[PDB]
Swiss-Prot record:
Source domain of life: Eukaryota
Assembly: Component of some HBO1 complex composed of KAT7/HBO1, MEAF6, ING4 and BRD1/BRPF2. Component of the MOZ/MORF complex composed at least of ING5, KAT6A, KAT6B, MEAF6 and one of BRPF1, BRD1/BRPF2 and BRPF3. Interacts (via PHD-type zinc finger domain) with unmodified histone H3. Interacts (via PWWP domain) with dimethylated and trimethylated 'Lys-79' on histone H3.
Covalent cross-link Glycyl lysine isopeptide (Lys-Gly) (interchain with G-Cter in SUMO2), where: K41
Subcellular location: Nucleus; Chromosome
Residue ranges constituting the Bromo domain according to the UniProt record: 9-113
Identification of the protein by name: Bromodomain-containing protein 1
Parent-protein residues present: 555 to 674 of 1058
Organism: Homo sapiens (Human)
Tissue expression: Highly expressed in testis.
Function: Scaffold subunit of various histone acetyltransferase (HAT) complexes, such as the MOZ/MORF and HBO1 complexes, that acts as a regulator of hematopoiesis. Plays a key role in HBO1 complex by directing KAT7/HBO1 specificity towards histone H3 'Lys-14' acetylation (H3K14ac), thereby promoting erythroid differentiation.
S-S bonds: none
Amino acid sequence: SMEQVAMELRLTELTRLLRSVLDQLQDKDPARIFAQPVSLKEVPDYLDHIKHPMDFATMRKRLEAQGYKNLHEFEEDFDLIIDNCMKYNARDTVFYRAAVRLRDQGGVVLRQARREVDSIG
């Protein structure tokens, strides 16, 4: 069907728009602490602490496989990154300080991105 075609083209263009948003968010991690999944070799107990790990490259696999049906699903994954960090790592750490920084700065990118999803449909 063609009504299936227009659902796709509208997804394809969410997927376009999220790509931009992720690039902006991942510029807020200049140190690349969030670039990649926490290594299980390096931190073998990690999953005893964090049940749903998340990182930018894992979000990016799922984005290029059109796997975010809306913005909320993308926003949930981003918050996973931040929240996991701020539980696993103590307050007086480079790691926790960087999640606090990404959360504050990424809140601006997301607050505009929410309007452009609603506007553009």
